[PDB]
Amino acid sequence: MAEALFKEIDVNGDGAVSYEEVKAFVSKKRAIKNEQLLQLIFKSIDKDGDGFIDFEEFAKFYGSIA
Amino acid sequence: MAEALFKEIDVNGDGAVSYEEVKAFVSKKRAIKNEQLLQLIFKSIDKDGDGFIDFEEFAKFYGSIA
Amino acid sequence: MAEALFKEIDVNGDGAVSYEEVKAFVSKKRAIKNEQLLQLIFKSIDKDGDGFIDFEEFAKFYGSIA
Amino acid sequence: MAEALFKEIDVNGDGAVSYEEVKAFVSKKRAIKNEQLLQLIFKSIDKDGDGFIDFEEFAKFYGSI
Amino acid sequence: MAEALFKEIDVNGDGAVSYEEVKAFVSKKRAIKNEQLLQLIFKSIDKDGDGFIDFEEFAKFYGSIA
Amino acid sequence: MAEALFKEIDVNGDGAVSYEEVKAFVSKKRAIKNEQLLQLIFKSIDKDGDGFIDFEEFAKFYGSIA
Ligand SMILES: [Ca+2]
Ligand SMILES: [Ca+2]
Ligand SMILES: [Ca+2]
Ligand SMILES: [Ca+2]
Ligand SMILES: [Ca+2]
Ligand SMILES: [Ca+2]
Ligand SMILES: [Ca+2]
Ligand SMILES: [Ca+2]
Ligand SMILES: [Ca+2]
Ligand SMILES: [Ca+2]
Ligand SMILES: [Ca+2]
Ligand SMILES: [Ca+2]
Ligand SMILES: [Ca+2]
Secondary structure (H helix, E strand, C coil): CHHHHHHHHCCCCCCCECHHHHHHHHHHHHHHHHHHHHHHHHHHHCCCCCCEECHHHHHHHHHHCC | CHHHHHHHHCCCCCCEEEHHHHHHHHHHHHHHHHHHHHHHHHHHHCCCCCCCECHHHHHHHHHHHC | CHHHHHHHHCCCCCCCEEHHHHHHHHHHHHHHHHHHHHHHHHHHHCCCCCCEEEHHHHHHHHCCCC | CHHHHHHHHCCCCCCEEEHHHHHHHHHHHHHHHHHHHHHHHHHHHCCCCCCEECHHHHHHHHHHC | CCHHHHHHHCCCCCCEEEHHHHHHHHHHHHHHHHHHHHHHHHHHHCCCCCCEEEHHHHHHHHHHCC | CHHHHHHHHCCCCCCCEEHHHHHHHHHHHHHHHHHHHHHHHHHHHCCCCCCEEEHHHHHHHHHHHC
16 A cells, blocks of 8 residues: 555655665565565475475475476 | 776776776676666656655555556 | 585584575575676686786777677 | 455456466566666656657767666 | 586587577576476465465465565 | 667667667667677687587586586
8 A cells, every 4th residue: 555655665754755765665675575585495495394404305405496 | 988988997097907896897887777777766756856755756656556 | 416515505514404504505606606607708808818808808898799 | 455466466356366377467567567667768868758769869868878 | 527418408419519509408497497486486375285376375475475 | 889879779760769669679689688698608618619519618617617
């Protein structure tokens, strides 16, 4: 929704989005999306869900990128 | 023109472009392009040209993309 | 192979790949690839192999973009 | 909003987002973005707003970029 | 070292890799990688494995990306 | 140079660059730039300049990046 996005970009809440706030916001979103993708990928490799990739989980991932 | 393009990369003026000067140039050019693009987008949203994006301007922009 | 790669990624040598480890490795590898490509490009201009592009080399390159 | 977003990827209105609709939505969204950008760029070069870039306009623009 | 990859690129078996063979290979590999990634994302959201994202599954996804 | 560029973009030769012309050109130039880069890489691997990569050239390249 238009209103919430505005409030999030407007960090100093003065009701004017500056160029610097736009730039910060775009960088922040890009960072968040890249971190989300990497976690999604990690969780896909970590079959047994324990937070680590063992050598057998790894080996399976690696043969399968084909 | 040839000299001018070389001089732009050769930031310490020694008449030779080092590998670090190439890397720095490739970064600077990419950063300039991204600034230019972002500034252009910004200016397109900033309908009254006052250097800031107000909620009204922001709603008009959000609405006309999706 | 998978083995060597697992070892490379497992920087702390504890036999497990952590998410922090995956992040480090992805950043490392991205950086290496960029550096390889920029080196390959630089080497193709640096015709005498001395580690600098001189103006003559530059003009041979600027001259040839066809 | 999750419904708004869902209802948009779900092109055929069957309440199910297929893999093909994901792939199409991703492509569509990429296309629209690029077109919008190219529109802005063009407009920025076409100072007099006549719908064409003349060599005078192209020359200015070739200045900065 | 490199033999399997060279043979995979060298599609006509002449013991040479041509520019067109390299190009066809790079495109082929890029197409498969983009497919594997998008499939991975899809599958992570399709929790019941039925090949569709239903509204519950999607809301869990979109909610989970904050 | 600029006029050479402008004339190249002005496909219909009417002295004006249209929006359709700009679109046509961006796709063209994108394609050209991607070919040019792949070409530069290829040429760097093809040490003997016969226009083909033989196995000993390929192995050398592969080793250099491994
Ligand atoms: Ca503000
Ligand atoms: Ca695990
Ligand atoms: Ca220098
Ligand atoms: Ca304004
Ligand atoms: Ca104002
Ligand atoms: Ca470890
Ligand atoms: Ca040199
Ligand atoms: Ca559907
Ligand atoms: Ca004009
Ligand atoms: Ca061949
Ligand atoms: Ca499902
Ligand atoms: Ca024309
Ligand atoms: Ca050769």
